[PDB]
């Protein structure tokens, strides 16, 4: 049975207006700004952008990837489709 979201998890995260997008729940550095609560720190592969979102908008990619995981003509998506599948826990820094 599923668990609450940790970090390291892979997602696809929905933002209004975007698809949904390749993404993973990131730690939060020492010393780092905190979420919100409730929310989690979404970090986006390809534009390696961190927004906070909640679990309405949490897909996990597992599960989601046969729908959602396919080439898209927004900027670093596709770049982003790379990273989750090859090397989703790196550093992107």
Same mark, same amino acid.
């Given at each position: 049975?599923?668990?609450?979201?940790?970090?390291?998890?892979?997602?696809?995260?929905?933002? !209004?207006?975007?698809?949904?997008?390749?993404?993973?729940?990131?730690?939060?550095?020492?010393?780092?700004?905190?979420?919100? *609560?409730?929310?989690?720190?979404?970090?986006?592969?390809?534009?390696?952008?961190?927004?906070?979102?909640?679990? !309405?908008?949490?897909?996990?990619?597992?599960? +989601?990837?046969?729908?959602?995981?396919? *080439?898209?003509?927004?900027?670093?998506?596709?770049?982003?489709?790379?990273?989750?599948?090859?090397?989703?826990?790196? +550093?992107? +820094?």
């Amino acid at each position: 049975m599923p668990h609450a979201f940790k970090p390291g998890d892979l997602v696809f995260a929905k933002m !209004k207006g975007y698809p949904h997008w390749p993404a993973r729940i990131d730690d939060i550095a020492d010393g780092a700004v905190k979420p919100p *609560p409730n929310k989690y720190p979404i970090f986006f592969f390809g534009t390696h952008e961190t927004a906070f979102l909640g679990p !309405k908008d949490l897909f996990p990619y597992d599960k +989601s990837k046969d729908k959602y995981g396919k *080439p898209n003509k927004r900027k670093g998506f596709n770049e982003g489709l790379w990273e989750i599948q090859n090397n989703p826990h790196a +550093s992107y +820094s």
